[PDB]
Write an enzyme that holds these catalytic residues in place. Structure first.
Site, PDB file in Angstrom:
ATOM      1  N   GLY A 126      -2.094  -4.834  -0.495  1.00 15.01           N
ATOM      2  CA  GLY A 126      -1.095  -4.459   0.487  1.00 15.01           C
ATOM      3  C   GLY A 126      -1.645  -4.060   1.837  1.00 15.01           C
ATOM      4  CE  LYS A 128       1.796   1.071   1.982  1.00 15.61           C
ATOM      5  NZ  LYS A 128       2.102  -0.312   2.440  1.00 15.61           N
ATOM      6  CG  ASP A 145      -2.395  -4.721  -9.067  1.00 13.84           C
ATOM      7  OD1 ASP A 145      -1.214  -4.483  -8.737  1.00 13.84           O
ATOM      8  OD2 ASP A 145      -2.804  -5.867  -9.352  1.00 13.84           O
ATOM      9  N   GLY A 179       0.027   1.948 -14.742  1.00 13.28           N
ATOM     10  CA  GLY A 179       0.105   3.200 -14.007  1.00 13.28           C
ATOM     11  C   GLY A 179       0.595   4.356 -14.858  1.00 13.28           C
ATOM     12  CG  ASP A 196       3.518   0.024  -2.464  1.00 11.20           C
ATOM     13  OD1 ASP A 196       4.758   0.087  -2.602  1.00 11.20           O
ATOM     14  OD2 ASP A 196       2.938  -0.971  -1.983  1.00 11.20           O
ATOM     15  CB  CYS A 251       9.073  -2.610   0.465  1.00  6.50           C
ATOM     16  SG  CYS A 251       9.872  -3.387  -0.955  1.00  6.50           S
TER      17      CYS A 251
END
Ligand SMILES: [Mg+2]
Ligand SMILES: [Mg+2]
Ligand SMILES: [Mg+2]
Ligand SMILES: [Mg+2]
Ligand SMILES: [Mg+2]
Ligand SMILES: [Mg+2]
Ligand SMILES: [Mg+2]
Ligand SMILES: [Mg+2]
Ligand SMILES: [Mg+2]
Ligand SMILES: [Mg+2]
Ligand SMILES: [Mg+2]
Ligand SMILES: [Mg+2]
Ligand SMILES: [Mg+2]
Ligand SMILES: [Mg+2]
Ligand SMILES: [Mg+2]
Ligand SMILES: [Mg+2]
Ligand SMILES: [Mg+2]
Ligand SMILES: [Mg+2]
Ligand SMILES: [Mg+2]
Ligand SMILES: [Mg+2]
Ligand SMILES: [Mg+2]
Ligand SMILES: [Mg+2]
Ligand SMILES: [Mg+2]
Ligand SMILES: [Mg+2]
Ligand SMILES: [Mg+2]
Ligand SMILES: [Mg+2]
Ligand SMILES: [Mg+2]
Lengths: 325, 245, 100
Positions: A126, A128, A145, A179, A196, A251
């Site tokens: 992304g 970031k 991820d 996660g 995110d 987003c």
RNA sequence: CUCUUAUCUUUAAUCAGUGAAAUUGACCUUUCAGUGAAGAGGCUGAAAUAUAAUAAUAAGACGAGAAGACCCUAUGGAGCUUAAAUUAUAUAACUUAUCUAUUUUAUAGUAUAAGUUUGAAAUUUCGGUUGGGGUGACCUCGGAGACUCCGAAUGAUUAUAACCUAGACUUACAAGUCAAAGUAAAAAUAUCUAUUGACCCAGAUAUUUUGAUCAACGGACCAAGUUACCCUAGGGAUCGCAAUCCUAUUUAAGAGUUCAUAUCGACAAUAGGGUUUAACUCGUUGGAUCAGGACAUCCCAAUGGUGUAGAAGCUAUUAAUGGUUCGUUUGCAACGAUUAAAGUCCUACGUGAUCUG
RNA sequence: AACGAGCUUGGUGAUAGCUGGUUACCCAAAAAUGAAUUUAAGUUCAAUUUUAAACUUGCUAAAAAAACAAUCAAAAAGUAAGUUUAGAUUAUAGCCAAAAGAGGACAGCUCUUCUGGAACGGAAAAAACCUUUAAUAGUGAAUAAUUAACA
RNA sequence: AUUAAACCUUGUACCUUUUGCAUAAUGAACUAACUAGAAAACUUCUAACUAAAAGAAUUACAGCUAGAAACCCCGAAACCAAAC
């Protein structure tokens, strides 16, 4: 019959239009129109070179005006000019990374401080990460991820920009694990956590048919997104150390995915785990960034970046939470 | 068998492997056999066969040897229709070869030449074109046809270097360079050159047909009448010019 | 694919015969047994394959192997399984070429 | 129609003449139970049993006839529809030429040719796997688990990795693997993770090389729908966990209770029914005629017990003897009047060579 | 006198991976697994099988020792086959019993693996279970499974 | 078998077909006549001559020449041409 893009537009018209009302027209066209890209410097040897070159292009770093460790040069208000394609530096590192200016606010908002351990759940390529790495002067880090291929390129990005010596240091750790499972692994480990969560990616969904959340087959995932977002956000809250600061970024413009998720997660932590979260106000941050960003204050929590025709840097919804105990 | 395609009598063609790309069609084309029909063939003759033929009286060593007398004695079999361009002498059997003979063969070899020369013999190489070879192997029928004898064309450009080379004992080669070439070969294989001139049959050994002659004793343009036992030679000046060429 | 021990004990093995193929280092190379890039084991001399277990001492240069060896306690000694090929032919013999 | 009857003609039956058709392996052509493929005149175990005709019934002979019906298959067709592929001097058009008039270049036309634009038409096609259908999809390679998951038609790093040649792995074939020796550059293996595409045929060069979501991934150079208007060749049939929530029986933590006056019930245990928890529509039969049998009895009959005073009942057992209604709305579900009762089921809707919706 | 496109002749003995059929005796040997395929109503290759020839070890078994009840196998022994070469197909859907996994670390059910069978004798039924080395004449004989149970 | 035609004992039509099973499913009223395996590249066998064989052109590092030895029947819906 209907393409995924058609369905995605339909959902916003029935739901998003009601939420924003008279603001929806400008936002609707903004999303259809081409996005604006802001070049991010790689620092290192090209630190001076890119800044001088970008000045020639007439791009101005919105961060610099805000101050008056990240500087991202952007074109003037209402300017449609396109930044030149990124090129490799003399040392072999890419000069700059093209990205959405709003995408850098979550990193700048997280209040990065020296001598910190940072986790980047579902970071993906992304941008970031790279931006955060440049901020990580003295800060151990960590990347996560769910997917591999998505994560595979993320390493390629690090190779292009991050020097090998910095990457070699444990500071840079790349992993691909769930996660929610990650929360139990390392509880109270990272002072700063940027989460995110996977979102509907409204801008991408409309433009791109490939891997569009609004496809009929993917119906199950779309409905369950709020539940998954809460769990991932809860996992980060478990992992952050006492007194830590966490930023949750979404987003999409959806009210359900943005405000209810964060407040609901806070309630879940308070009940099940008996933990308290202190809300933080970034209104002062908004005032500095008014020139380069436009926000709407309707949201009770979070600072959403509405995409505007004059400033088409949206959409980014980022909220910062500090772990009280 | 039971009821089915092969039993109805209507199974597919050979090389059909059910529908997948066949084995014979899926291999790259290569030029193994390209130009095969125009490659030159020389029916080889070894020295064992030559000596064996001379021993049994099926070749007359005293007379000059040529392709006609090899075929007449069934020593060799030649097929002009299958691109045969003559007979190539071969090195097999050189040690057992102790015969002096004047052999004409289209292709020769270094070691084969040594066997002929060491025993005191003459070896020469001459080119016969496809039309000439057919008449040489099979003379009689040509005389029955009634047509005049034809001229023998010179070798094409590809073969010109070979038949003009002294070491290869080419018929068109320079006569002056033969002595030196023979001596060098004589030293190489450890034998002393014999003096053919002193030999009683110098004329026979030295005999060589004209480069435009298919047969030693017959000139181009003549006609042979077997029934009357006569030879007819044209008196026309125009034809003589053409044939003499 | 089809990874296994091609040559069992007591089998005659010619120069180039491949003893076995392994996805990972299940069997380590032994005397007169070369190791291929794909990690397959091939013999080097004619012989009879014999499998033995011997102490494994890593090269000093590689860090990972050295660190693991140090981590072992003083008493403990590790072992690995090796494939060996005992030569079964004399490399050469002497003959009288000529008497001068 | 309740509820059928009477007479007459026809047909029938008998005497006389004439003389078909479908059908037919052979038949000296039985009943019951068993077995079996919803299946038995012929097999197994009992039983029955002089031989033949004439006239009747239609239960069986999966009774006989028809170009009827149904699901599936074929590198079988044919009709229609075009947003299918390939063409397309039907037409129309225009352009350059040829060519005849004309004016110094010019505008005219054109027994033609070469193009461009429309298309009246012609030709050919309907991949495979998903218990049928529309939607999703999936079709090759490899990693992991024991079918569930992850990836790929590789990128980065590469002071750049030769040629030749013993023996082997793998394997239908094709493809793909490892490699001593010898020899040669240089001062031995590129680095992980893993990664595919044949032949033909077109490209490139100064002799060395490149061409595929050919992904339907052993790959037709290039072809979609539709048929109930259809046709032919055949084949068919005719259980798991969890997560709460209800309930039922046994628990009872509790409270309880108060002169024909009381229990309920935490929490459990056990049986059921849902819900969350894992891709996007459905699969012969009434009636009429005649009924055969089962009893798990609706009525008649014979009895026990009773929270059976008498009168209504309720519960139970024994018993298959005969009986077990007429209509209205009409697609079977209700309804109205009665009855001692208006039984529950089996007999391939029991029964269409008896009839009908 | 049966028009989604007349009829007659010819092409034409159209073509059919589909259905049906394919005529004397005798002796002998004899199997529906793997791969690809507009492939699964087909064909081709491997494997199997077979006729001949060449010459030499083969099958059962196979101690120790490996790699872990098997993969491998040495002296032996019981015994006669095995390898190579040349030629050639059909076959490529099983059926049922008994064992063992594996699918939901289940039974079942669907698969996968090993074993066995195809009476004229026996088991109410009876190709598949049990007794049975081929087939010949005899007004011989000894036998197998079984002809239920007496708990 | 029998003294005896029948009684007594034994015995689930045929073909094709399904799996190597039928009490299935196809086909047959019966008689006479008619009615379906065809080719020599490679192989085997038998001879003539033999580094040569063959009655012209072919093949050959024991070959070459000749002989014998082989691969069915019936049936569509259709398609095209020309008459009527
Ligand atoms: Mg194909
Ligand atoms: Mg010749
Ligand atoms: Mg009558
Ligand atoms: Mg009468
Ligand atoms: Mg009778
Ligand atoms: Mg009778
Ligand atoms: Mg009966
Ligand atoms: Mg019966
Ligand atoms: Mg009976
Ligand atoms: Mg009847
Ligand atoms: Mg066609
Ligand atoms: Mg191959
Ligand atoms: Mg080497
Ligand atoms: Mg395909
Ligand atoms: Mg394929
Ligand atoms: Mg394959
Ligand atoms: Mg209609
Ligand atoms: Mg109509
Ligand atoms: Mg009755
Ligand atoms: Mg009773
Ligand atoms: Mg009525
Ligand atoms: Mg009936
Ligand atoms: Mg098998
Ligand atoms: Mg097919
Ligand atoms: Mg087929
Ligand atoms: Mg019949
Ligand atoms: Mg036919």
């Amino acid at each position: 019959q209907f393409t995924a893009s058609r369905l995605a537009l339909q959902n916003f018209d029935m739901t998003y239009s009601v939420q924003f009302g008279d603001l929806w027209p400008s936002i609707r066209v903004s999303l259809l129109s081409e996005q604006k890209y802001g070049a991010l410097v790689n620092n290192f040897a090209a630190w001076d070179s890119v800044s001088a070159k970008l000045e020639q292009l007439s791009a101005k770093d919105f961060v610099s005006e805000a101050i008056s460790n990240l500087r991202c040069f952007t074109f003037s208000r209402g300017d449609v000019s396109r930044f030149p394609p990124a090129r490799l530096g003399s040392l072999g590192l890419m000069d700059y990374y093209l990205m959405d200016a709003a995408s850098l606010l979550p990193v700048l908002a997280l209040g990065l401080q020296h001598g910190d351990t940072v986790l980047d759940l579902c970071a993906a390529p992304g941008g970031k990460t790279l931006a955060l790495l440049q901020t990580g002067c003295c800060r151990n880090l960590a990347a996560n991820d769910l997917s591999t291929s998505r994560t595979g390129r993320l390493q390629k990005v690090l190779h292009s920009y991050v020097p090998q010596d910095i990457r070699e240091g444990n500071q840079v750790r790349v992993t691909s694990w769930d996660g929610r499972k990650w929360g139990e692994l390392e509880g109270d480990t990272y002072d700063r956590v940027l989460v995110d969560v996977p979102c509907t990616t409204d801008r991408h969904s409309l433009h791109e048919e490939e891997n569009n959340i609004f496809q009929r087959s993917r119906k199950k995932e779309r409905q369950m997104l709020p539940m998954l977002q809460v769990q991932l956000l809860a996992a980060g809250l478990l992992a952050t150390k006492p007194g830590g600061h966490v930023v949750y970024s979404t987003c999409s413009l959806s009210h359900l995915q943005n405000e209810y998720v964060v407040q609901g997660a806070i309630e879940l932590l308070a009940n099940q785990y008996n933990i308290k979260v202190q809300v933080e106000d970034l209104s002062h941050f908004r005032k500095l960034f008014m020139d380069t960003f436009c926000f709407f204050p309707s949201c009770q929590v979070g600072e959403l970046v509405i995409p505007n025709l004059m400033v088409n840097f949206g959409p980014m919804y980022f909220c910062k939470l500090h772990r009280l105990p | 068998g039971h009821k089915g395609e092969r039993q109805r009598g209507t199974r597919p063609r050979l090389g059909f492997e059910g529908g997948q790309t066949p084995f014979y069609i899926r291999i790259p084309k290569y030029g193994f056999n390209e130009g095969h029909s125009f490659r030159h063939q020389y029916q080889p003759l070894s020295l064992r066969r030559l000596q064996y033929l001379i021993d049994l009286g099926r070749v007359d060593p005293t007379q000059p040897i040529d392709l006609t007398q090899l075929v007449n004695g069934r020593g060799v079999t030649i097929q002009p229709l299958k691109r045969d361009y003559g007979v190539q002498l071969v090195e097999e059997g050189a040690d057992t070869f102790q015969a002096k003979i004047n052999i004409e063969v289209q292709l020769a070899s270094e070691l084969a030449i040594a066997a002929i020369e060491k025993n005191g013999g003459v070896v020469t190489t001459a080119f016969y074109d496809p039309r000439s070879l057919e008449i040489l192997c099979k003379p009689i029928p040509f005389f029955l046809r009634g047509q005049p004898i034809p001229k023998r064309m010179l070798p094409p450009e590809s073969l010109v270097p070979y038949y003009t080379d002294a070491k290869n004992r080419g018929y068109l080669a320079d006569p002056a360079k033969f002595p030196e070439a023979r001596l060098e070969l004589a030293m190489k294989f450890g034998y002393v050159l014999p003096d053919i001139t002193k030999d009683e049959l110098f004329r026979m050994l030295s005999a060589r047909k004209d480069p435009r002659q298919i047969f030693f004793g017959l000139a181009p343009g003549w006609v042979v009448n077997m029934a009357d036992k006569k030879i007819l030679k044209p008196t026309d000046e125009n034809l003589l010019k053409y044939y003499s060429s | 694919k089809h990874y296994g021990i091609k040559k069992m004990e007591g089998h005659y093995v010619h120069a180039g015969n491949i003893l076995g193929t392994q996805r990972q280092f299940r069997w380590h190379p032994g005397a007169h047994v070369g190791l291929g890039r794909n990690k397959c084991l091939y013999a080097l001399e004619e012989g009879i394959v014999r499998y033995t277990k011997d102490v494994y001492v890593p090269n000093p240069k590689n860090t990972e192997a050295v660190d693991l060896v140090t981590s072992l306690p003083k008493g403990a000694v590790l072992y690995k399984t090796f494939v060996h090929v005992v030569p079964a032919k004399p490399e050469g013999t002497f003959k009288l070429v000529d008497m001068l």
